[PDB]
Paper text:
Non-specific phospholipase C (NPC) hydrolyzes major membrane phospholipids to release diacylglycerol (DAG), a potent lipid-derived messenger regulating cell functions. In contrast, NPC harbors promiscuous activities, hydrolyzing major membrane phospholipids, such as glycosyl inositol phosphoryl ceramide (GIPC), phosphatidylcholine (PC), phosphatidylethanolamine (PE), and phosphatidylserine (PS). [name] is divided into a phosphoesterase domain (PD) and a C-terminal domain (CTD), and is structurally distinct from other characterized phospholipases. Mechanistically, CTD contributes [name] activity mainly via CTDα1-PD interaction, which ultimately stabilizes the catalytic pocket in PD.
During NPC41–496 crystallization, another set of crystals were obtained after about 2 months. A structure of this crystal was determined at 2.1 Å resolution. Residues encompassing PD (residues 12–258 and 264–415) can be well built in the crystal (NPC41–415), whereas no electron densities (including residues 416–496) are observed for CTD region. Unlike the structure of NPC1–496, no phosphorylation, metal ion and free phosphate molecule occur in this structure. By collecting crystals of the determined NPC41–415 structure, SDS-PAGE results shown that the protein was partially degraded during crystallization, possibly resulting in the omitted CTD in the crystal. Comparing the crystallizing conditions of NPC41–496 and NPC41–415 structures, KH2PO4 was absent in the NPC41–415 crystallization. Superposing the determined structure of NPC41–415 to NPC41–496, the architectures of PD are basically the same but with a significant local conformational change in a loop (including residues 250–268). The catalytic residue H264 in this loop twists out of the catalytic pocket in the NPC41–415 structure (with a measured distance of 8.4 Å), compared to the NPC41–496 structure. Correspondingly, other active site residues are deflected to a certain extent. It showed that the substrate hydrolyzing-activity of NPC41–415 was almost eliminated.
Numbering used by the authors:
A (entry chain A), B (entry chain B): 12 to 258, 264 to 415
The structure:
Amino acid sequence: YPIKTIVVLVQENRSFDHTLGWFKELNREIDGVTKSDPKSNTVSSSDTNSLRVVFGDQSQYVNPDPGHSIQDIYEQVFGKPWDSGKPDPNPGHPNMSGFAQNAERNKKGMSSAVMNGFKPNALPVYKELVQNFAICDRWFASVPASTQPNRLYVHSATSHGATSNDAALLLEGFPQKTIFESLDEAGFSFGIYYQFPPSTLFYRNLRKLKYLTHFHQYGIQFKKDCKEGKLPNYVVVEQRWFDLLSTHPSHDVSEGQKLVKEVYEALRSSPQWNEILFIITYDEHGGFYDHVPTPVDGVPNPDGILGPPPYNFEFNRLGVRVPTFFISPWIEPGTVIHGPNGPYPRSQYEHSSIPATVKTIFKLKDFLSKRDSWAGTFESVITRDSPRQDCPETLSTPI
Amino acid sequence: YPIKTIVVLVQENRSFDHTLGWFKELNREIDGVTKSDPKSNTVSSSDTNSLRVVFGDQSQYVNPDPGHSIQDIYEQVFGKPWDSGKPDPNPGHPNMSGFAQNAERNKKGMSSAVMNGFKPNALPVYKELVQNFAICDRWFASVPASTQPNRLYVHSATSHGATSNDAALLLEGFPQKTIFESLDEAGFSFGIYYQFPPSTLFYRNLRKLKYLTHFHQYGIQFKKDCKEGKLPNYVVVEQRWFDLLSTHPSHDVSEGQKLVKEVYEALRSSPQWNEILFIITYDEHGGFYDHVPTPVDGVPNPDGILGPPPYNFEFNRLGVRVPTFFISPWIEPGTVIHGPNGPYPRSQYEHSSIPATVKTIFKLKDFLSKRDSWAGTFESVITRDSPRQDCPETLSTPI
């Protein structure tokens, strides 16, 4: 089994249908969207009783940040708002009908951004990566909540009860065991390449003296370690600082495309390219539309810890589908992975799939929680007998 | 008393003589340096004989970062290194003779940068601020240690035992009472205007919900509140993110001049200009040379907490002199404040002077610590009967 280096890049706040849904005309196998059988959500307002908003392919490069709190996402997936005076934590029916309404509730006119996705040619970096490697069109954010609970799952398969971006809790640090500790204890290496203060600092255990040395400034160390073949066994690329103090500004998809291109090309020209498995995913969907109902059946709480009031979240429902890419010369081009042949009938691909698959590939002894123990593993995406030799050396520049 | 808004900007890593020492030619009253009676430090090395390095005015805009740990500063001020096998915490004799030796010890050739200051004309923003307002030439960093223990003093008059930049300790947060809490309890407002993640988040008490709302993005909110005269009673401008993971890279003094210019002009064109007292100081001296012996007599420990081993620091010695500016239309131009007039015979101006003076100007009930209660207060710098009306509207662009 050729994979010795696993590289993880977690992007920000985009749904599958918004990012890749229109890539379906390039490959019908992609569970995306079409113009002929279009998806839609309705909007109610004081001025109008009902307006149908069709999911289109007119996403602009610059967009506001839609709502992605646990309470926003409740309205998006169930089509009705949370009501603390009439609490309905498990209403049963994720029909994905509330994205446009939740957008409008948060900011008038924002349903246009929420109800649009990108044309493939507007994201050439992604179009090339989809066509030359693999994606998963059934990969759900771990939590129907915001950025940090999901990021906590990426490297620990739990959020240790968190469903918000609680500045005090994040700074105090979350104490659960991380995949870094599993790897280290088994003698494997790991490195976190950061630009700004990384969200991985929110793991309290990584603040031990012996683990703080595994953080490396990205600009200094990343391209260098790629060039001389010195990448550790588990590489995390951390790019943005999370504004802990941000108690719906616009921003550009282009920066993320540039980062993906740079990271890919550095891995692609590395002597370790033939041992590398590169995963790109999104922390959560950002409030953008997606048509696939979030799983509500057979989803385990990772550690028995409930979320804070008023939601008292049971972690018995997944988040919304996000774009996930698998990139390796050992992968056939244009491959699309759906649900797992996961260990259980109701297993799903989600962020805990990353620690699960790391545990599987490196034969670590134990899973971290009940979530990585249950999540699908994607090591079977590595299918070739020999590494492909003509993988693109460079990708197109973002528009 | 005309002062209703106090604004604080803390710059990084520069000594008084390095920044303002050559202004003595412009104002003989300044305790600076001359060419005819020059300061010097000696260097001992293996290959070469003892070499005198004279303090010159040849500072370049780009310099390395000299040593400014508690152990480096011990050698700088006492002229001998710390010795854990022969510990000498209170050697008696701050002769300021070790800056060049300590520089060479950290990086060969670095004594040249450490033993140089700026020509006044090389820093036009500062030269204009000095000539149009006030400086203090006897203001000491609170701690002969690194960045964060000193920044803790600026808004709390203690470091709660800290003598290093301990990432785990900083993220856990320091729990001492802050001047923000003194102000809030007395009905006054405060605002922290930050660009990147602010060091004030290291105060644990500011992570409460009711205080997190007082943080404002600088780019969004600062110039705005300056225009509409909506500045709170205590303004902190936070500009740089401290890399907690940095376990001697070069950087440019020009960025700090640009920031100072931007902040000054925004306060100067504000309707609140006639009620504003703006203080600029430096967290500590960065390891650059200064000739004034650090006070070792009558310096109180703020709260009885000792520093960590091996130094077990008693907080009975001040840090090195830093540049400090007082800026307000109620200030006589070209004013230089020396040591304080009380509250005690051995009182000194230092970072705790900021909380002390805030307590004095706003008649807050209690000081925060024994340092606060002992430090000099500079309210007497406000001397005019009417606000000056021809304060510079704009400043020179940095070279």
